[PDB]
Amino acid sequence: FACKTANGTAIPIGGGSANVYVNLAPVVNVGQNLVVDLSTQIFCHNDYPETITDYVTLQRGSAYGGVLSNFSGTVKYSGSSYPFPTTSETPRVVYNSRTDKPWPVALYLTPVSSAGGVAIKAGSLIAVLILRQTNNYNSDDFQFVWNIYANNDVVVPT
Ligand SMILES: CCCCCCCO[C@H]1O[C@H](CO)[C@@H](O)[C@H](O)[C@@H]1F
């Protein structure tokens, strides 16, 4: 089991960490969602599907900078919605193929009432998402740490 970003940055067998640079809607109104779709950014595969079933969860998701201060979040994992920052590990997503499959993570961020102006700064850390991988074969328990950075400023109109 290993993962890669849309740009080619890979995390090999055993896990580790990588940076994900995301373009964000430049203008988000109060009452609207800022959608951060990581399913188009992070792709994973099973290296031995003939024998092994890989189990994948979002172990935890943390918010930073402008996202923590200015937004109310929800994380959608494989069609199910949960609070973001996270309060529990999600159910497992099965990886049973050698073909790259998107990691089904999407953040839904709505501005808080106090938000106004530059709510997210360009180049800032916005989230850290922990992909946890296990299997039905051995004691392997690996963490694929995804550091999410904003490519641009996000303005919340006043
Ligand atoms: C003849 C025995 C061959 C042993 C195959 C081990 C390959 O391990 C890697 O890929 C696995 C499948 O994706 C992961 O379950 C595992 O945790 C690790 F990432």
Side-chain angles (χ1 to χ4, degrees):
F1 182 94
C3 300
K4 66 185 174 79
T5 70
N7 84 358
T9 305
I11 308 177
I13 289 160
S17 65
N19 303 327
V20 188
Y21 302 93
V22 295
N23 295 321
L24 303 166
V27 184
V28 184
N29 291 292
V30 173
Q32 296 190 320
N33 283 318
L34 170 65
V35 184
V36 189
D37 190 15
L38 290 318
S39 81
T40 61
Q41 310 296 306
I42 301 156
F43 306 88
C44 306
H45 75 280
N46 184 330
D47 283 293
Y48 196 29
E50 295 81 357
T51 308
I52 307 178
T53 300
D54 288 325
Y55 301 119
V56 169
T57 63
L58 169 73
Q59 193 194 333
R60 82 164 159 278
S62 301
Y64 295 90
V67 170
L68 183 68
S69 298
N70 304 306
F71 293 82
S72 183
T74 299
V75 59
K76 194 182 271 190
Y77 189 65
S78 184
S80 281
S81 290
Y82 307 98
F84 172 84
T86 68
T87 57
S88 65
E89 179 167 23
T90 63
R92 291 173 263 183
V93 167
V94 165
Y95 282 73
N96 50 22
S97 183
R98 200 171 269 112
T99 306
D100 294 319
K101 183 164 103 167
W103 186 46
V105 176
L107 301 184
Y108 289 82
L109 316 164
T110 197
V112 296
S113 305
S114 66
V118 179
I120 295 165
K121 294 238 186 191
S124 70
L125 181 69
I126 62 161
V128 174
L129 311 169
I130 303 171
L131 184 161
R132 183 182 172 200
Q133 174 256 319
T134 62
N135 60 48
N136 67 342
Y137 181 81
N138 61 11
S139 78
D140 293 359
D141 198 341
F142 303 130
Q143 291 173 311
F144 292 70
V145 178
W146 309 94
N147 303 306
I148 322 303
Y149 290 88
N151 271 333
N152 57 281
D153 279 358
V154 178
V155 170
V156 172
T158 55

